[PDB]
Amino acid sequence: HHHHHHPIEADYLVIGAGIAGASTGYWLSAHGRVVVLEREAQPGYHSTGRSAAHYTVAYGTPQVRALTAASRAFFDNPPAGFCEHPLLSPRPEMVVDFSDDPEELRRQYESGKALVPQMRLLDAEQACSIVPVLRRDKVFGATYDPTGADIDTDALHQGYLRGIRRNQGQVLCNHEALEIRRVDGAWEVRCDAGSYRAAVLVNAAGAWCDAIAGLAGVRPLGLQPKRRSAFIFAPPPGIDCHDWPMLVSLDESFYLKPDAGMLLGSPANADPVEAHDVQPEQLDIATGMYLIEEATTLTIRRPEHTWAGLRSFVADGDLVAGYAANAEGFFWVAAQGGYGIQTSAAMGEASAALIRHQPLPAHLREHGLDEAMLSPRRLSP
Numbered sequence: 001h002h003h004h005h006h007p008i009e010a011d012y013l014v015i016g017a018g019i020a021g022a023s024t025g026y027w028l029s030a031h032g033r034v035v036v037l038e039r040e041a042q043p044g045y046h047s048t049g050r051s052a053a054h055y056t057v058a059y060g061t062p063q064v065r066a067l068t069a070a071s072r073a074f075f076d077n078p079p080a081g082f083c084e085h086p087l088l089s090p091r092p093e094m095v096v097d098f099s100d101d102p103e104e105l106r107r108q109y110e111s112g113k114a115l116v117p118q119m120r121l122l123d124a125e126q127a128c129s130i131v132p133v134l135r136r137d138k139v140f141g142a143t144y145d146p147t148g149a150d151i152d153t154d155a156l157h158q159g160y161l162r163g164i165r166r167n168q169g170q171v172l173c174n175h176e177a178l179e180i181r182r183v184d185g186a187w188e189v190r191c192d193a194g195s196y197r198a199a200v201l202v203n204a205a206g207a208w209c210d211a212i213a214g215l216a217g218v219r220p221l222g223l224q225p226k227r228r229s230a231f232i233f234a235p236p237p238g239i240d241c242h243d244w245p246m247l248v249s250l251d252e253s254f255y256l257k258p259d260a261g262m263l264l265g266s267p268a269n270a271d272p273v274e275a276h277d278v279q280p281e282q283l284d285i286a287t288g289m290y291l292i293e294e295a296t297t298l299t300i301r302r303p304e305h306t307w308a309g310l311r312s313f314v315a316d317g318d319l320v321a322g323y324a325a326n327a328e329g330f331f332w333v334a335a336q337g338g339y340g341i342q343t344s345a346a347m348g349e350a351s352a353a354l355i356r357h358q359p360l361p362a363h364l365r366e367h368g369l370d371e372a373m374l375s376p377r378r379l380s381p
């Protein structure tokens with residue numbers, strides 16, 4: 001009984017305009033009519049706007065590391081017109097053993113080196129030379145990856161969205177998917193002012209991917225959102241930290257990285273929560289500050305910024321890009337975990353190819369990617 005606009009027909013409806021939907025949409029948009037439906041007034045209000053903006057190959061499961069490695073070429077050399085400035089800035093990563101676990105440190109070095117030939121094994125004095133605020137008594141060695149990079153996430157994200165629009169796609173904010181139904185051979189999404197129809201529904205809804213499946217009547221993946229908090233604080237007078245690496249503890253108890261002229265800290269937490277607009281917890285922030293003040297000579301007065309975001313995982317820690325079994329046209333782009341920005345070029349290209357029933361492009365297969373490794377079918381016996 002209330003007015004709605006006539007339905008809009010497309011080839012692919014993408015739910016969510018974060019890095020997952022934007023990257024998938026970007027690679028789809030040259031081939032057909034893309035409509036991206038985003039709940040919020042802005043596309044990057046949830047996880048894509050809350051990251052540490054870093055690129056690190058030796059991080060995550062083997063599938064994650066391949067997706068990340070395979071994304072570098074786009075990031076370093078994107079198409080003409082994609083963006084105005086470089087997407088990556090040099091930022092090596094140093095993983096420091098603060099718990100005296102040489103066997104773990106060696107395992108991570110050998111593992112890392114196998115993918116990153118320039119990775120180095122450092123002794124405690126070498127780690128303290130690189131970040132001189134480290135407490136030598138607390139340091140037992142480190143790994144060092146000279147190939148790490150900071151990512152200009154806003155430029156990357158906006159580049160994907162602009163690409164969609166240049167290919168006559170639509171990116172519609174304030175268009176929460178409220179209902180989803182298979183109607184006359186298409187998926188039909190009701191938003192508050194009108195509905196959208198396409199043969200393909202691309203579920204790129206971040207921590208809400210299983211909620212979208214629940215609207216559609218599609219069996220969910222078992223996605224678990226996990227809260228991670230972070231904060232920005234001023235370095236003490238006299239400390240010039242602008243060229244420090246990203247510093248991470250071996251057991252992921254905290255990390256620390258320069259953010260221009262400030263420092264970004266985090267307790268690197270993973271507290272399981274429901275999908276929601278997540279806020280930082282005081283205990284998260286206090287724990288991160290405590291651990292930084294114990295590992296280093298830094299004293300932290302009060303943060304300039306605090307936030308938290310959701311890193312969402314399925315049971316095996318791997319990303320998901322594939323059609324749902326037994327649910328025609330429903331395509332998952334999910335389980336980005338702590339890796340959705342640094343994997344986005346490979347995930348977007350792969351997902352788009354698979355949506356289109358195409359082979360994975362050579363450069364992706366050469367990095368050891370295949371359809372089965374990405375598929376949600378692997379979560380099932």
Ligand SMILES: Cc1cc2nc3c(=O)[nH]c(=O)nc-3n(C[C@H](O)[C@H](O)[C@H](O)COP(=O)(O)OP(=O)(O)OC[C@H]3O[C@@H](n4cnc5c(N)ncnc54)[C@H](O)[C@@H]3O)c2cc1C
Nearest residue numbers: 016018020039046047048052054177206309339340341342
């Ligand atoms: C503290 C922290 C540090 C991190 N560090 C890094 C890092 O250094 N590098 C890295 O690669 N990753 C990092 N991550 C991970 C990265 O943030 C996520 O993997 C990535 O942002 C997930 O993108 P997404 O598109 O899946 O999710 P989101 O960006 O959350 O996008 C999903 C979108 O779906 C929309 N949506 C949900 N439901 C609906 C609906 N009903 N209708 C319409 N739209 C809907 C949401 O509003 C949202 O905009 C970090 C994350 C955190 C929190």
Ligand SMILES: N=C(Cc1cnc[nH]1)C(=O)O
Nearest residue numbers: 052054055056311338339
């Ligand atoms: N991905 C991160 C941080 C990161 C470190 N190096 C690259 N990324 C996270 O906190 O999920």
